[PDB]
Amino acid sequence: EIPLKYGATNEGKRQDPAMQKFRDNRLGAFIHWGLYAIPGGEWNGKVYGGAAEWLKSWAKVPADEWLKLMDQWNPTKFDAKKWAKMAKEMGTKYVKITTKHHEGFCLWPSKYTKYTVANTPYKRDILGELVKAYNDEGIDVHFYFSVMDWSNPDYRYDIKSKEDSIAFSRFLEFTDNQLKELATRYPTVKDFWFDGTWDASVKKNGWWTAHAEQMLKELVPGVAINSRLRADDKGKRHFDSNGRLMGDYESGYQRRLPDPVKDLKVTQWDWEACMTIPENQWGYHKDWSLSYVKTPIEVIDRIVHAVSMGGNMVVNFGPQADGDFRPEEKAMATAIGKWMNRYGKAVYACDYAGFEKQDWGYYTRGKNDEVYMVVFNQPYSERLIVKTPKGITVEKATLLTTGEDITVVETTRNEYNVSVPKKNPGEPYVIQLKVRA
Ligand SMILES: *[C@H]1O[C@@H](C)[C@@H](O)[C@@H](O)[C@@H]1F
Numbered sequence: 001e002i003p004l005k006y007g008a009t010n011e012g013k014r015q016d017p018a019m020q021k022f023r024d025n026r027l028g029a030f031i032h033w034g035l036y037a038i039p040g041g042e043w044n045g046k047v048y049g050g051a052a053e054w055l056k057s058w059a060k061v062p063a064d065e066w067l068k069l070m071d072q073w074n075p076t077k078f079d080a081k082k083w084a085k086m087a088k089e090m091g092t093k094y095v096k097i098t099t100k101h102h103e104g105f106c107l108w109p110s111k112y113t114k115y116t117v118a119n120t121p122y123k124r125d126i127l128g129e130l131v132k133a134y135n136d137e138g139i140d141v142h143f144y145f146s147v148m149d150w151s152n153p154d155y156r157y158d159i160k161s162k163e164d165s166i167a168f169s170r171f172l173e174f175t176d177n178q179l180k181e182l183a184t185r186y187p188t189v190k191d192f193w194f195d196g197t198w199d200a201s202v203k204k205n206g207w208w209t210a211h212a213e214q215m216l217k218e219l220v221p222g223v224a225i226n227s228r229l230r231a232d233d234k235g236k237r238h239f240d241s242n243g244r245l246m247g248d249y250e251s252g253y254q255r256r257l258p259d260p261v262k263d264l265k266v267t268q269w270d271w272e273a274c275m276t277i278p279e280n281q282w283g284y285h286k287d288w289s290l291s292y293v294k295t296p297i298e299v300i301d302r303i304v305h306a307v308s309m310g311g312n313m314v315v316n317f318g319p320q321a322d323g324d325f326r327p328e329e330k331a332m333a334t335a336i337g338k339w340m341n342r343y344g345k346a347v348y349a350c351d352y353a354g355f356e357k358q359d360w361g362y363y364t365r366g367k368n369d370e371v372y373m374v375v376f377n378q379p380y381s382e383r384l385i386v387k388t389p390k391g392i393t394v395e396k397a398t399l400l401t402t403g404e405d406i407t408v409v410e411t412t413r414n415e416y417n418v419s420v421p422k423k424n425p426g427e428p429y430v431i432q433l434k435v436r437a
Pocket residue numbers: 051053054195196274282
């Protein structure tokens with residue numbers, strides 16, 4: 001059992017009220033908004049297929065050039081109340097915002113750098129207005145923060161000389177300063193979601209990542225901290241050298257989700273997936289025809305998937321340069337909200353139900369031991385196979401929307417056929433089971 005000073009802190013899942021709230025929220029939205037939204041995946045006449053928020057890299061734009069985009073930052077359509085209404089209508093319970101992405105441009109007016117919203121034509125504290133607006137709607141706010149900072153000349157990818165170490169130490173102090181500022185300026189913050197912490201420079205300073213977590217937990221009662229931040233004494237990331245999870249929840253899943261049959265280990269900790277609507281675009285890219293774009297049903301499936309295996313799911317948005325959302329994102333939020341309004345009882349405050357996975361879709365467990373069947377794949381047999389854990393019976397099945405009673409037939413030991421509804425709902429639907437132990 002390797003000794004470590006900067007490994008895991010939490011034993012199992014936190015069950016203080018703040019973490020229960022983080023968990024029970026379940027469905028979140030992500031905001032990627034920064035200077036990259038201006039060029040929108042395109043530099044000086046050449047469109048790049050890579051992720052838009054990383055365009056500075058793909059086009060090899062020097063920091064001094066990249067940051068002049070600040071002079072163009074003027075989102076006249078921006079309206080925080082509207083953003084928050086969109087999120088309320090979508091059924092999102094929390095929103096994660098990029099405070100500062102790799103590019104280093106801050107969405108709040110930081111004291112520790114000129115590269116902020118303050119020194120743009122728009123001037124205003126975007127982050128502050130979002131915090132206020134989402135909170136007004138009863139919506140928690142989480143802070144995405146990139147440790148890697150392409151606008152700070154003290155950042156290092158590795159520590160190779162005395163000179164590197166001098167610069168990076170000062171950079172860690174700079175970073176500390178920004179984090180402390182975020183924490184005291186916006187004390188309703190409920191989560192810090194770190195990114196750009198993979199570089200050798202960070203791995204060699206695991207102590208700093210443990211310090212970062214502890215500092216923020218001291219300034220912000222019950223704040224959550226993602227695993228992506230954390231490196232142990234040896235530079236093992238996410239999970240320490242003893243296989244123990246660091247931070248408060250796992251945050252490696254994006255693009256992929258854990259297998260509902262093979263990866264039930266995820267149910268032993270809190271975790272959160274974040275996903276993009278196209279294949280790999282977080283910030284606004286002007287040309288969505290470049291890769292596969294997920295449909296609403298596809299996204300809702302990933303949402304229910306995550307919850308059925310005891311995880312959060314967060315749907316990304318990359319707002320336009322003008323401060324409005326592309327119509328594909330508006331339709332996504334609207335379609336999701338319509339579904340959530342009919343079926344959210346099976347998502348909010350639900351968890352892993354402990355049943356074997358079946359082809360028609362996913363189970364979730366409600367807080368009062370309700371067991372929802374969420375059907376994405378409608379069997380031609382007109383029967384939904386339910387195999388119960390040892391000790392468990394099905395007493396009733398009810399179509400959530402109508403309250404209509406659903407036929408349950410015992411087929412064998414620990415197994416039932418639950419009938420499809422008499423009329424096909426025509427969309428992914430929920431059947432709620434009443435169970436006895
Ligand atoms: C960190 O991960 C996601 C959420 C994006 O912000 C990506 O650009 C970055 F590398």
